[PDB]
Ligand binder design. Sequence first.
Ligand code: ATP
Ligand code: MG
Length: 158
Amino acid sequence: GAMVVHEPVDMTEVIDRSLERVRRRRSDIEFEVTVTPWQVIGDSSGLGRAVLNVLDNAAKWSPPGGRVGVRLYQIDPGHAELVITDQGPGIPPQERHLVFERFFRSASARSMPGSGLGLAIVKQVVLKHGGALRVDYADPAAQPPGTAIHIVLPGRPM
Ligand SMILES: Nc1ncnc2c1ncn2[C@@H]1O[C@H](COP(=O)(O)OP(=O)(O)OP(=O)(O)O)[C@@H](O)[C@H]1O
Ligand SMILES: [Mg+2]
């Protein structure tokens, strides 16, 4: 099967590389980045693909001048949580079980080119690294509430 890469991965570099790519596509977005140093054992290319796919969605559905939050904090001795947030329409509660399935398309989000594979890839990468993920509103009290993608990754503080 596909090569299984199991090497130390600096998540600060993974996120910084992913951000460089997407800042090009939407230079108006205010990316608010708060990343605690975190090392994951795995596949830097796969993790980079997963973070870029989430950042790409956050940018696509960001309003002009929108803020995208990119936050990674340790939550216990062996895990950290990456939360990527936008000020887009958000994904409503009833759809949150189609998110991460191939070919999902939200009726709340404006139709854009893309065939609905990015988040299925994210789920695969995160599971292959022993993580977990979920979707929620970024700020339920705000209009619009935005989407928050939450990714928990095992690893260690650097
Ligand atoms: N941050 C977000 N804000 C609003 N809607 C989102 C967001 N992220 C994902 N979605 C919705 O979930 C769908 C699935 O997302 P996903 O990234 O898997 O597919 P895509 O972006 O349409 O295509 P691809 O990622 O394959 O280019 C999107 O088409 C969109 O309806
Ligand atoms: Mg996508």
